[PDB]
Structures are given as structure tokens and as C-alpha cells.
Amino acid sequence: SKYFTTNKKGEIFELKAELNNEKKEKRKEAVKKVIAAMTVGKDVSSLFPDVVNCMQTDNLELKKLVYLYLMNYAKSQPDMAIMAVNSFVKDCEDPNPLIRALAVRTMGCIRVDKITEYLCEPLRKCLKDEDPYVRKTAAVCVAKLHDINAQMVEDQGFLDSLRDLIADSNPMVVANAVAALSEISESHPNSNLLDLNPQNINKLLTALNECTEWGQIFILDCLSNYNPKDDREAQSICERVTPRLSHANSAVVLSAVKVLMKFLELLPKDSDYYNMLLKKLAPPLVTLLSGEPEVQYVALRNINLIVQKRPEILKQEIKVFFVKYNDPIYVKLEKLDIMIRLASQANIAQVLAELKEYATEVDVDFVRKAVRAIGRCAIKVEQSAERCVSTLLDLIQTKVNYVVQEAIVVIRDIFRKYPNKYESIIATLCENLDSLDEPDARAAMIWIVGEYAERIDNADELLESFLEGFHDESTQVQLTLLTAIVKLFLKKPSETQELVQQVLSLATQDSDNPDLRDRGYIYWRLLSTDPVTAKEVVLSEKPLISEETDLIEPTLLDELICHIGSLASVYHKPPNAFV
Amino acid sequence: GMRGLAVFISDIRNCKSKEAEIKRINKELANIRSKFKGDKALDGYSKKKYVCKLLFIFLLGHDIDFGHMEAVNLLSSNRYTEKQIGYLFISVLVNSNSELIRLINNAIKNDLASRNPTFMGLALHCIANVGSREMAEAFAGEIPKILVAGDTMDSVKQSAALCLLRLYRTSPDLVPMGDWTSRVVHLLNDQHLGVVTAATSLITTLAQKNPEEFKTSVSLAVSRLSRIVTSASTDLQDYTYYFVPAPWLSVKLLRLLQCYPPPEDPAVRGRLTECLETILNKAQEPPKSKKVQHSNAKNAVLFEAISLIIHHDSEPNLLVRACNQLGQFLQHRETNLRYLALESMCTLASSEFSHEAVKTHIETVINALKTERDVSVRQRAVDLLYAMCDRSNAQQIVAEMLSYLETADYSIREEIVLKVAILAEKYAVDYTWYVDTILNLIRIAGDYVSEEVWYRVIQIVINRDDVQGYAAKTVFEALQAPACHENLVKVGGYILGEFGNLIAGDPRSSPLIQFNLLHSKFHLCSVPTRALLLSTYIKFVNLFPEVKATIQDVLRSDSQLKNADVELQQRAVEYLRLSTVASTDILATVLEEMPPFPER
Amino acid sequence: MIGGLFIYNHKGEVLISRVYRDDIGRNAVDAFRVNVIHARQQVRSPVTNIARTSFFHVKRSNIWLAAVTKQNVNAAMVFEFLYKMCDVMAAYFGKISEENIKNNFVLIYELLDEILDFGYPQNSETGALKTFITQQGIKSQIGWRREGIKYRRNELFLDVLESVNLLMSPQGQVLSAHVSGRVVMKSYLSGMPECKFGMNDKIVISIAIDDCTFHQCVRLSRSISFIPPDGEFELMRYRTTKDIILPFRVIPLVREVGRTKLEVKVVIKSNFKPSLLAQKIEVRIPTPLNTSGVQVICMKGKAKYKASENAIVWKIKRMAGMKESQISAEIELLPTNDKKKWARPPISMNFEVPFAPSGLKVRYLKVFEPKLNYSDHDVIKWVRYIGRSGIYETRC
Amino acid sequence: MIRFILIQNRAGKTRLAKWYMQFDDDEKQKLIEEVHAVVTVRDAKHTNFVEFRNFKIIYRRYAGLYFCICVDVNDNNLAYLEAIHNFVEVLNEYFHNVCELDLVFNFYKVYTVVDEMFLAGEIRETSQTKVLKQLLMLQSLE
């Protein structure tokens, strides 16, 4: 029922009694206690009216406190908050401009229906005001009003004033209004944010240099949506935007790179400017790796895209993309991928050695990544595969378990890529057979035994070792063991009869998975009807295989490179995949 | 009472920061340390107030390393407030200073020797609160003697019995089973019900290890219970809760009965049954209050009673009446009541006697299930559904379970699918029922179905087939909704690649569009799914040559023979070489009808 | 642009919050508590996407800051803003800990108002926030190793030895769970080396209470610096209670039809990667004492009865991950006593897995010997995680 | 048998904590945190019986405070919830419509009430009248 709720003794009653002292200093600490109570989760709605009774105050600090209270109520329960609009509207005209701005932003914070009729007059009032800070707030309030349900055909007069704001005097003003208007345009009427290209763009780029650390980002994002038409136009644009190596290292530099790489469509070698850009882009892209970790993550997920698109720029920086011991793992991974991408044939001398170092760290998963990176490197410069397999042999000889597994999984790929070029190594792999547990590695080892069976006269016992423990093993090893045992049969008959009976049977009579059963019966009929077609049907040269996955779609790349700096890049997904 | 304490606590509550508070507390600690170490002897009042402040500080969370000396000095006083504060402090801060332990044993010995029942109350409370093995050795020899003496006041009898309980739980060896048994069990006939409360609780916890020494309690138990239940409204006025006569005493008395077999005296047994029936009947009248309190209080006794009957399990009529009441509960506002009824039906479903009674309410159960908002309630309901599924109602139960899966939220899917699979394996009266249910389950929520389940369904289709058009059409249709997920792709691909000759007749079941289905599912499925699809591909190529070209057109793609994985391309090469070349007729001797699965 | 800002303490309760666009409800804060902080095996990333919403979070020494938004916001801007905010907070009250936040609520709201408007991070240089902020924060505040050790071949091995403890309710509610472990380090080094060792954040520096004790040599500053004694020793002991990664989940099913028949099925599910391997698993199923006989069926491992021990035992030689196995059993009860309702004791399991159930992972290790030549690049290191079942029970 | 009684407001601050089992200080703080966290996330439609480490919790919110009694799993539930309401009413009657600030300023009598109606983990007295009379009798001494 209603115990513990009386207001004659206890906290709430005591605060309510305090809130009515005529010593303002005590009212201050009073409302402060109230705010703390709101935050901690204590029900203070009962205090509501008298706190509003405290709004009748000349003091700045006290009114600030009460406005913070009302803001706290705004986004949770708006109807309650509305009960002070009579003062809110009697707040947008006071002296102390801070009061004006506070009132405007707070009123905008409300999200209810009837606010518009209350708000249309003050807001439209304050856009045309002497003070900068107030206009900086009111510009935002406009977008606030737009997101709440209102097309509010006066919104056309609003937008008139808003375009009139881009021709402002103070930097932060336009620095904010441009962002407000761009956000308006995204919920998209096709007739919005028209660019008076020469005049408006000149004004934007004049205000850019005086702008605040933050608004430059929005300026650049508004330019990005612009589409030029003529060459010298783009020349002048890139010239003016050029000097960006600015302080907000993460943001301004990245968005400048966006506006550049979107405005990189000129006669390349007719003027020595294409070269000039391709030269200037490198120092900032590099210096964006010295900041904090998260900035480094974003910069790397964008530089990956850049390398995908215009590799001529970063073609000689594979040193700065090395992995340091103390980085967060989500940076090591990006550095590794970029290193693979830049792995030319000239610098392998260090690259294939650098990776040789990483395979001796302790961060296990990263070591897996490094071994497979050696692998993928051995498929992008053919003229080094021999050294690659040599380094892999070294790593195997290290006899570390969770390294030898990825090592052998990559050596399988290598052999299948360049067949019959590293066949002396095969026997040496087998001696490292006892220490293979994971399914991938077991399968790859058995597969290597599959091919090149006539290299080893010991291949029989090798697979006979797995044959006993046939269950408790994944389907992969079972199927690959089937294929391999049969391959061994056709190449060395009269000595596998002992095997191809129990292998086949243990696969088909015993196992339950009907797919292994299927392949078992398939192989059974081939090797029972005629050994003349078995060879031509199983032993054919499986053609060469290329890693067709490692590239991103070109038009998708076009899209993302139109969205460099935004959140769109860091996922490598188009903006539609999230509203 | 003490103004200084109040101002202290107020200042504490006005601290603007944890550091300011902790500084103020260290300051007060320094002050009280000084005044205790000051050579001036102290007045009782000041010592009381100061130990109060100490206790408060300890309760806020800090540490306190002194004061217990005054705590000892405060037991020998004679003003009640001082005795209270002292015993409180000594009870809250447990410490093993052997000398102080001895002092406290001395002071409590003195108090128990006294005659004011208030002092005896405080002493017994402290003993019950701390309860060290030493206080055991110091008073467990006396406490029953305090309990059995006739002139001991009431509250003394209550608290003394409870403290004997606390002793029994802490130190069982230090309470010998002497003579007081008779009088402790005779306690029950007292008029002051509180005496009965204490005596019952104590007798329960004692009899839980020596029933044959307390068997004589059940008669008084049932007599008191009868006198309580057949009471009038204006009886036990001090001991009646919202027009309910003596709930807690009834609860504890039934609990006491729960520790014993059925009573051996026939008239006792009969009066007991009449009490239970009385409770159940009283449970059916309209309420005498719109207030939740009455409902909770009465239903407490009700649940206690039915649980007792279950512990007895000899009154079938009572059992079924209980079950019918329970079923009436299942549709109720009080989520508490709904949960509790479900919980109790869960165990009732284990009876030789109430099984069918539970079964009858199945539609109520299912309707509660189909709309309930809690997660625990739904879980319990599904578990009950499991609990009452047998040869009779399995089919309907399973059908309803699947129909719920058709929309049920994630939080239950796992155990629902597990239980439906197990029920199917258990009571499937025929193949076609079994295969139908399994396949529907897969279509609906495959990505939780075990590995062995669809192994088994494919196995059984291979054996006793006669469902091929059904299976084929089911997977066919489920595929063309854009939601079809993996295990369905697997099972259907295999089975239609085995038996598509029995679906290829529908104009909307063309071999071409069959392959188009399967290829539309290809570029989303993983590698073992792809392998299964490639085996079915060649099975088709053996049967329906009408796409023999385009299939091969796919098999030759960069995506197939340049495949990154090894086994995909292995199968691809083998099958392309089987088909395009190296035979066109021996294909019929390799891709035959998959000889039937043997019996394990 | 900036959907809504939030500040959490390490327990995961909202220390403070402020939203900006109504398209962000309670679901947002709950999702960021249950999908990032309390995430278990997910690979972390300072930008994460769930249910068509994006989260950015920065960690400050125990305090999570997070911004949430749905628009296609300029990513770099988010993080530069978070750094500016953490710096302004520092400049007003020094380090960032729960205490300073709980003691400057008012100032924090003043900031989140002024610095951040509707999601548009207006100017935030600390020298200039005096204009708009009027409040004022409140500040507050060898002998174990011989020298002259000579080995021919540098080596070392780290073993994260942990023991997990679990007790679960039949509907799968995790009642009790905690892991106690220690980092045993066995070395072979020549000389007086320094070592630097760092790990992730899953270990903060009859009732389980988190704890972390070091060895006398360890030195803190995050990271670890120390000079190991020769031979084998114990580096640090610790105990954790959250975010545990329960290897096996046991689901029981029990149907007691009559008072003579009793059927029990158990199904175990492996909740980890499909390439790992848990080894030497044992399941102990209880049974009432007046149990005459048993019938058991299993297609994984092998089970048998122990009448003296009064339990069914079920051994598993090895098992993979993300798979499901099942044992069935029927029980005929000797109807001697028509009493004694069997309060069935929990079902227990023993197991050994090659991954730290507590989520600990050895991040990085550098070995540097100054006076001699060698360094990390010249020493061979092995790592092994070993998590073992402690008390691992499921109420059936 | 009861294990521990808590009167705990929304902030997690404990107005009253009476134990009936041996627990060290650290684990006391720990259990308080766990119970507050498991209880403050339910709604009025949620049940009242929530399982807990080796026990269950019978709780009830009274619009500003939470009463929580830890009970052994094999004990009645509705009875203990109603006993909580009973004890709440005893407080409400003694303190003249008790408010939490009183539970702060007057702990040394709250403990008196608690031990009066509960002792050694069982329910001692149920009749509100006799307890009230005992209380106002003790309040008269000196």
C-alpha cells in the first residue's frame, strides 16, 4: 500500500522544507542535494513544483542549477517538464546572454507536440541576435526542432535564416550551422542544401582556417558531398584544403584525406600535381600512427582502404607499419594485414624476417596470424617462396606446438600453390607428427602425405597411426584421410590392401554421418569395378588455385572511398546496412 | 534520547565527500579513545552514549579496535538503556579475547540468575546472537532448565526455547537429550500461542534427527491445528491476520507434521484429514477483502497443506481435490500464485494417484504457456508439460510445443527443441509421425538441433522411406522462404538428391528450379553444406540429365575448381571427371540407391 | 551525431548518463552493458555494432566512457572528443575513479551540457570553460637470486594454472561461479635480467571474493616489472568472479513416474571454439540410496555404475567444442520405504581444458639483460594455459 | 531458517543488516552487493521469489526501500513474505508511520524490534499487539 511514503518526517520532507529558506546559499546546496538524489535513483518528483518555485531568481548559478534539474527530467518524462514552459518562454529575453542560450537549448530539449507553438516565437526571435553564443545554440535548436515531428512550413523561413547563417562572421557559428544543416539534409528532400559553388564555397573555405578545432570537420564533410565540374576548380579546392595536418590529429587529417581522395580526378601527368598529391599524402598518413590506440585503429582501417585503391602512395613505408610489442591486439592485427598488402618483392628481405620475429612472441592468436601472414606473403611474391618455406622450416624446428600447427597448415597451402618445388622437405615434416592435435593441422599433414606418397616408403605407418583413433576426430580429418588413403592405394597397390579395407569399412560400416557413408560407398564402387579409370578420375591435376578472396569489390571500394573518414569505413560496409 | 548521537549522525550525513566523512570519523575515534584512556572514571550515561557512537561507526563500514572494555563494564549496570546498548555492542562485534569471553560469561551467568524477565530476555538474546562454543560450554547446561521451570515468564520461555535451538544448530554435542523432552513437548498446550510458535520450531529442528523421541508431538499438533481451522472469526483476535486464523502457527505445525510419517492413531488420522479438507474448502469461498494480504495469507496455508499431503501421499481424494484447486489457480493475477501452482504441480505429476488429474488441466497449462510474460513461469510450464506427457497425450503435447516454437522467443528455444526431440524419440508411435515432427522441428529452429538428430531422421528415412514426397515438398517449400537455415539445407539436399524422382512432377518442382533453389542456397552455406550439395549435384546428374550442361557450367567456374578449401575442389574435380568424361553409363553403378542402413 | 554519453564503473552500473536523441532507449544502455563490458569471448574493438546501433568506448583505469549513436557519424571525431573530455575531467579533479565521479555529479552534468550540444561537440578547451561552468570540483588524494648464474641456452615457460568453480540450477541459471588461479613461471636465464610482462584486464589489481596477490619481487607502476629468481616459482595468485567462460553446460532431465521408476537423461554442451579439445572429462550422476538396478545408454565415452559409491560415472576420453552429447538411464527403485522423499544431490563434473576459463590471456613479455648482450629476440618462450574443474555441480 | 535480513534503499546503502550465520566482513559486503544488484532490476509484474547462491531471497519493495529476507530453499515463501509485511507494520505502528530517516537515527531500537520478532533465524512472535505492548513497556524504563 502506502507505507514509508509520508511527508511529515524523513528525507523528502526535510528537503522540501529546506527549499523554502530565504537564504539563497542554503537553497543552492538544497537543489544540489536534490540533483544528487535524482542521479542516485531516489524518487524526487514530489519535489517538482517547489524547485520550479525557485526559478524566480536573479542569480545565475541558481537558475543554472534548476535548469539542469529540468533538463534531467526532459528526456525521461517530458510532460512533467512542460509545466515550466510559462517561465521558459519568460526566459529567452533576459540579460546575461548565457541565460538566453540556456533557455533556448533547454526548450529545444523538450520533445512533445505542443512545444512548437510555444517555441516558434522565441527561436525565430533569437536567430537574429547580437550575441554569438546564442546563435550557436539556436542553430542547433533548429535541427532539434526538425528531428521532432515538424515540417512546420515556417521551417522554410527557418531554413532561409539558416542559409543566411552560413554567411556569418564568427567561426564557431558557421562551424555549427553547417553541421546542423547537413544533418537536416540527410533525411532527404532532394531540394535542400544547395551549394552556391563559387561564392558559398569561397566563403566556407575562408572561414575554415579561422574555425574551431571541431567545426573544420563539419566544413570538410559538407565539401565532401559537393561534386565539382572543371579541372582548375578542383585545383583551387585541393590547394586551399592542402595544409591540413592539424591538431585534432585523428579527425581533421582523416577528413582532409577524404576530401582529397574524392577530388582526385584530374589530368594526372598533364600537370605535376597528381604527383604532388600522391607525394603529400604520405607524411600525414604516417603521423596518424603515433597518437592514442583507438585513433591508430581508425587510421589503420582507413589506410587499408587507401592501399586497396591508390597503392602508389604508401609503396615504400613498410617499416613504419611494423608491430611493436606493447600495442593493443586490435592494432597488431591491422598492422599485420597492411604489411601483407605492402609486401612487395624488394622489401621481403626485412618483411620475411620481421615476421620470423613475431612467431616468437607469447600472444598466441597473434602468432597464428603471423604464421599465416608469412603464408599469404608467399602467394603474393613468387620470387621468394623458397625463402618462405625455409623460414617456415626454421619455425617448425623451434618445436613450439601452437606454432608448428599453423606452420604446417600454411605449408600445405604452399605446396598446393607451387606444386613439385619443395619436395625434399616432406620427409622432415613427418618427424614432427606426434605433436599435432588440432583438426586443421592433422588434416593438412595427412593431405601432404596424400600427395607425394611415392616420396616416402614410410607413408603406410603414418596413416595407420591415425587409422586406429578414427572416431573422436572431426569430419575433416575423416574425409581427408579417406581421400589420402585411396590416393596411396592407386599409387602403391599390393601394399595398401591391408589399409583400404579397414579404412573404407571403418568409414562406412561404423560411422553414422551419412555423408562420410556416401563418399565411402562412392570410392568403394570405383576401386571395385576397374582400376583403369580410378587413376584418371581421382589423380587428375587439380589446377592451380589463387586466393580470390583477398580483394574488395571495386565499386564498393568507390563507395567507401567516398566515405573515408566516417564510421562507414571502419566496418567496410555500405551505409545502408545500418539506418 | 541522546542528542549528541543525533547531531553526530546529521553531520555525517552532511559530508560532501568520502574523505571528509572518514576524517570526521577518525576524529571522533580519537576523541573517544582519549576519553576512554583518560584517568577520569566515567559516568554510566556517557559510557552508554559513547559505545552507541562506536557501534554506529562500525555499522557504516569502517574498523573499530577498542571499546569492548566499556562493553564489559556496561553489563554490570542496572539501567535498562545501558544494558541494552552493552549487550548490543557485545553481540555485533565478535572477538576472541579469552579474558573478555570469560567476563561476558560471568555477566550473563549473573543475569540469568536474576529474576527480572527483561534482563533474562537481553541475556538470552545475546547468547542466541553470538553463540560461540564457549557460550555453549557456559550455558547449554542451564538453558533447558530455564525452559522447563514453571514460574518462568512467557517471553522468557519463548526466547529460551529459541536460544536452545541456536545452540543445537551451532553445537550438537553440547545439548544432551535428557529429561526435558516431556515438558518441552507438553509446551504445546499453552494459551500464549507464541509459546507454541517457539516450541514447534524447536521440536521440528530437534526431531529432524530423533523422531522416535518426539513422536508424541503430532497429537497436540493436529489438535491445535483443528482448533485453529474450525475457529470463529472473532477467536484468537490477537493472533488473527486479515480475517485468517493463525497462519504462521499453522504453517509451522504442518511443517512439524512433515517430518513424520502418517499418524498411527486412527482418530488422529481422521481429524487430520478433516483439517486438511477444511483448509481446502475454506480456500474456495469468495474473499473477505479486496486486499492482497488476505489472499497471500490464506494461500500460504493452502500450499503448506497440499505439500503435506504430497509428503503423506495416502489421501487420493485429497490429492485430486488439491490438484483441481491448483488447476483453478493457473489463470490468476498473482504471478506469485501462478508460479507456485506450477511448481507444486511439477511434483504432483509424480504420483500414482494424481497423474490423470494433472493431465486434465492440460489446456489451461498450454493457454498459460502461450501467453505468459515471465521467463521462469514459462520454463516451469514447459517442464510440467514434459512431466505429464505419456502414451495418451504425447501427440497433442508435441503439436502444441511446435506451434509455440513457431513464435516463441529465444530464451526458451533450446530446452523446447531438446525436449521435443526427446519426446519424439520416446513415444513416436509410427515413422510418419516421427519423421513429420522431426522435419518440422528442423524447418522451424534447426540451428539448435543436435548433430545426431538429423543423422537419425535421415537414417530412418533411408530405412522405412514412404515419406519422400512429404520430406521433399517440406524442404522444397521451406527453402523458398528467404529464411531457410543450415541443417535444413543439409537434410533436404541429401534427401531430395536421393529421391527427387518423386517430386519432379509438379510444374513448380522442376529439376531446373530444384537446382536453382540449391544454388540460391549455395552462396550462403558453409563448406560441409557445400560438399553435401556437390554430392547431390552428381546424384541429380545421374538422374535428371536435363541440366547436365549447366551444372557442369557451374562446376567449371573459377569459384569451384580454383576453390580455396581442399575438399570442395577435390569433390568437384572427381565429379566433373566422372560426368563429362570417363563414363556416361557406369555413373549408374557408382551413384546407386545407397544400400539400406544396417541395424546397430 | 553523438547519440548519448554514458560513464560506468567497473561493476557495470551506470555512474552517470545523458542521452540526446529519443531514438536511444533503455535498450541502449542495457545492450552496452550486456554486449561489450560483460562480453566473454568476443574480440574487442573500440567501435562495435549491434542491432543497427554503434558504440564507442574508452577505458580510463577503471572507468568506462561510452558514446552511442545510430547515424553514420564521423568516427575519428568521436574518439578525439572522448580524449578531450577525459582531459577536461582530469584538469578539474585529477585522476578518474569512482569516488571523484560520485563526488562531482553536479560538475559532470555541467560539462555534459556545455561541451556537448545535441551531439555536436562545441568548443571544449579547458582554459575557456570558465565562461560557462560555474561550479568547482573537489580534488582528493635483491637477495632472492644469486648473481653469477650461467646457462648455455636461454629459455622460459609461463603456465596460467586456473581452477573454475560452478554450481548451476536446473533451468540453467548460474548460481555460483568463480575461478582461482596463479601464474607459475619457470625460467632458465644467465645473469641479472629485467622482465616486463603485461596482460589484459580480466584480473583487477565459502564466499568467493576477487583478489590478486603478487610475489615479493613484483613491481607495479597496467603492467609488471620484475627480476625472476632462478628455477621455478609463483608469480601471482588471484581470484575472479565475473564474466566466466563456463566450458561445459550440463542440462539434466529427471522424471520420477511412480515411486519405483525413475528415468534420468543428461545432455552436455560444449561452449567454446570448435578446434580446441577438452580432455579427461568425468560426470558423476547421483542416485537415491534405495536403488536396486540401472540401465544406461551413451554414445560418447563410456559410463558404468558404482553401487558402493552410490553414483553413475561417465568418462569422456576427449571432447571437441560446440558439440552436444547425451546419456540416458532408467532406474528401478526398491520400494522398501514408503517415505524419505529423495532430495537429490547435485550432478558433478571434472574436466581439463587448454584455455583459461577466467578469460586471462598473456598479452606480451619482454626479457632484457643490460650488461650482457641478449634480449627477448634471443630467448625461447613457451606458454600453456591449464584450466581445471574445481567444484563443478549442476542441480538436477 | 532465515539467513540474513536486509533493509536496503535504492542507492544500495544498507539501513539494516542482521545476520544469522558466520560470515566475515568482506563477504558480508559482497553478499550485500549481490543481493542489491539482483533485486533492483525486477518490476512489479516480476515474482517475489528469486534464487540465490545456496538459498532464495524473499523481497518486497515499499516505495523507497527494499525488505529482503534470505531463506533456505526448502522453506515456505508466502509465509515469509507476509511476515515481512507483518514486521513492516509493526515498525509503522511503533514509529508513527515509519520513514527511513527514522531507521537511521534509531538503529538501537530497530535492532530491538528485529530480535523481538525474529531470534536465531526463526519467527518468534506474530501478534502485533503484544509486541507493541512489550515495546512501549520497555520505552518507559530508565
Structure description:
Chain A is mainly alpha-helical. Chain A has one domain (1-579). Chain A has helices spanning 11-18, 24-40, 48-53, 60-74, 78-82, 85-89, 97-109, 115-127, 132-147, 155-166, 171-186, 197-210, 215-225, 231-241, 251-262, 274-280, 282-287, 293-309, 329-342, 348-358, 364-377, 385-397, 401-417, 426-431, 439-450, 459-468, 475-491, 497-510, 514-529, 533-538, 554-562, 567-571. The longest helix of chain A has 17 residues, at 24-40. Chain B is mainly alpha-helical and 600 residues long. Chain B has one domain (3-589): Leucine-rich Repeat Variant. Chain B contains 33 helices and two strands. In chain B, strands 1-2 form a two-stranded antiparallel sheet. Chain C folds into three domains: 1-141, no CATH class; 142-245 and 356-396, no CATH class; 246-355, no CATH class. Chain C is 12% helix and 44% strand. Chain C has four helices and 23 strands. Chain C has helices at residues 26-37, 75-93, 98-103, 105-114; strands at residues 4-8, 14-19, 47-50, 53-60, 63-69, 116-117, 120-121, 155-168, 174-188, 194-199, 211-214, 224-226, 231-240, 248-255, 261-270, 278-286, 291-298, 302-306, 311-319, 324-333, 347-353, 362-368, 380-394. Chain C has a nine-stranded mixed beta sheet, with no helix packed on it. In chain C, β3 and β4 form a beta hairpin. Chain D has 142 residues and is α+β, with helices and mostly antiparallel strands. Chain D has helices spanning 25-39, 78-94, 100-105, 107-117, 128-138; strands spanning 2-9, 14-19, 49-52, 55-61, 65-71, 118-119, 122-123. In chain D, a hairpin with a 2-residue loop joins β6 and β7. Chain D is globular. The PDB classes it as endocytosis. Keywords: clathrin, clathrin adaptor, ap2, clathrin assembly, endocytosis.
